[PDB]
Amino acid sequence: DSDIAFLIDGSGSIIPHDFRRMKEFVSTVMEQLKKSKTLFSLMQYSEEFRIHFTFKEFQNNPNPRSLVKPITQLLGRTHTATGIRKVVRELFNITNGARKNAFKILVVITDGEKFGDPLGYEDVIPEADREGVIRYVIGVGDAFRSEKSRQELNTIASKPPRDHVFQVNNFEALKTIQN
Amino acid sequence: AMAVDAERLKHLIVTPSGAGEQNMIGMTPTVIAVHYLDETEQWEKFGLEKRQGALELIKKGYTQQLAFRQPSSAFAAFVKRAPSTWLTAYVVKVFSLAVNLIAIDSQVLCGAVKWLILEKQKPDGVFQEDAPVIHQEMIGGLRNNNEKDMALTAFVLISLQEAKDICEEQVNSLPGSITKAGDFLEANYMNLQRSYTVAIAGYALAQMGRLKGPLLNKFLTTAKDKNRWEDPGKQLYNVEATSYALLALLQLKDFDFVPPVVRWLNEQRYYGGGYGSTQATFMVFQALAQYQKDAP
Ligand code: NI
Ligand code: NI
């Protein structure tokens, strides 16, 4: 009774090591949470956008490590805002596998540094609220180093931000959100 | 990223000797060696006693190069040979980076800049070479390039900008020449086909803040797999071009494109030195040092 979407950062600011962490973190979340009938969808973003599997395509292929294995990095710039808008309008459409009256969960995995994006956060957030989209943010690299980066993670996440923002390396990231 | 181990840069300490061009070839790696080690601060694991042993070598190359300074403050291989537009612009380029290393006489540096502007700049901004250098292997990817006025103008302009602040007072026609050169590049940037010219002219535009819109898209999309600017042959040219792009990316504060570019450069394992390695040696270490200075 929940639709979970993954919006992962694939920009060049994300080192290949941190991308493996992203690629392994998703596998853990999908394996340690099935736990049916939770549906999963994933889209990698940069300056371009690529849907690796929709809610329909995941319902046909149960194996988590199989759908994420061939995923590579885009290496463009970082368009976080546009990625968020694309998720709520496309991935959460019933034509893609989104079920009616099911919880909409967006898991934004970024380093908290949007760049080159024509869209701002103030253009995609008020739209994500009127659609009722639960937003979790998973910071990577030095997302907690700066102040503009940490406030960006809180900006993407809903309120309160203390229940949504987590570090990627945490293996207790799933056992803390289930309860 | 992590700075390059200074132990693999020992061969860059070269004793300068030769003519107006031969001396700069040996002077180049030494100047850019200590410039990199200054920023990365590796004088402790390398020996501070060796710093003066190389710093004075730069002074030696400088004084020996002054003997080939023509009365018009221009530079040629020989005192009787017609002055080269490229060599003069390269002397300005090397000296500008060494002003904080040794005592560089400002009258020499500014005199060469004034000569390039007054006598070697076409009214449309184009810089023209009327007496090419003998050692054609010291000019990097500028050797046998289809393009053209663009490549040479981009090169000279980069030198002028690196000496803009230090020679703005003496040479007043400097900001005007800079703008004129930038006007020609911006007007013909979209028509560029070779990745080398795209990289070097892109950096010249980026230093002005004139690398925007379609010019930027042209620049970024020219990159093979978003990590290097590659032309078919001559690896040394591709290293030089990618270094110019890195400098352009660092100017744009684009830290989405910087890491894969730097990562590629480090996987080439190039440490300079050898026949026809002057530009690549100077570029790959000016860029990586600028990266170290700018990397969070
Ligand atoms: Ni990024
Ligand atoms: Ni670092």
Chain B residues 187-226 with a CB less than 8 Å from chain A: 225-226
Q: Which of A76, A142, A145 is nearest residue B256 as measured by Cβ atoms?
A: A76
d(CA B279, CA B239) in angstroms, rounded, equals 9
Q: In the CATH hierarchy, which fold is given to the domain comprising B1-296?
A: Glycosyltransferase (1.50.10)
Q: What CA dihedral angle connects B103, B108, B109 and B114, to 10 degrees?
A: 160
Amino acid letter, B27: M
Counting Cα atoms < 13 Å in the Cβ hemisphere of A138 gives 27
Nearest Cα neighbor of B150 from B208, B204, B112, B113 is: B204
To which residue do tokens 């394996």 refer? Answer: A31
Ligand having the closest approach to the CA of A113: 1
Residues in chain A within 8 Å Cβ distance of B254: 77, 115-116
| B257 in reach of chain A (CB within 8 A) | yes
Residues A14, A20, A26, A27, Cα dihedral to 10°: 170
Asked whether the beta carbons of A92 and A55 are under 8 A apart, the reply is: no
Range of the domain at A98: 1-179
3-state secondary structure of B275: coil
CA distances from B184 to B115, B126, B189, B261 (A): 20, 7, 8, 28
What is the total count of domains within chain A? 1
Q: Which of B286, B294, B28, B40 is nearest to B7 (CA)?
A: B40
Asked how this structure was determined, the answer is X-ray
Continuous H helices in chain B: 22-40, 49-66, 85-97, 106-120, 149-161, 174-188, 195-206, 214-221, 235-251, 258-266, 278-294
Cα distance between residue B184 and residue B148, in whole Å: 12
Which value, to the nearest 10 degrees, does the dihedral of the CA atoms of residues B222, B227, B232, B237 take?
100
**Burial state string for A160-170 with b = 16 or more CB within 10 A and e = fewer than 16:** ebeebbbebee
Resolution (angstroms) equals 2.8
How many Å apart are CA A121 and CA A115, to the nearest integer? 12
CB B135 within 8 A of CB B22: yes
Q: Which are the contacts of A33, defined by CB distance < 8 A and separation ≥ 6?
A: A174, A178
Query: What's the CA gap between A17 and A39, in Å, rounded?
Result: 27
- According to the 3-state scheme, what is the secondary structure of chain A? CEEEEEEEECCCCCCHHHHHHHHHHHHHHHHCCCCCCEEEEEEEECCCEEEEECHHHHHHCCCHHHHHCCCCCCCCCECHHHHHHHHHHHHCCHHHCCCCCCEEEEEEECCCCCECCCCCHHHCHHHHHHCCCEEEEEECCCCCCCCHHHHHHHHHCCCCHHHCEEECCCHHHCCCCCC
Discontinuities after residues in chain A (C–N over 2.5 A):
none
Contact call for B256 and A12, based on CB within 8 A: yes
Question: CA-CA distance, A102 to A94, in Å (whole number)?
Answer: 11
C-alpha to C-alpha distance for B95 and B105, rounded to whole angstroms:
9
How many residue pairs bridge chain A and chain B with CB atoms within 8 Å of each other? Answer: 31
Among A72, A77, A110, the strongest candidate for a mutation testing the B interface, having the largest count of B CBs within 10 A, is A77
Q: Would you call B69 helix, strand, or coil by DSSP?
A: strand
Question: Which two tokens mark B32?
Answer: 């850019």
B164 upstream amide cis, omega within 30 of 0: no
Q: Measuring CA to CA, which residue among B10, B111, B32, B33 is closest to residue B66? A: B111
CA distance A162 to B268: 44
Task: Supply angle C-alpha A63, A68, A69, rounded to 5.
Answer: 100
Return phi, psi of residue B124, to 5°: -95, 15
Which residues of chain B from 56 to 95 reach within 8 Å of chain A, CB to CB?
Answer: none
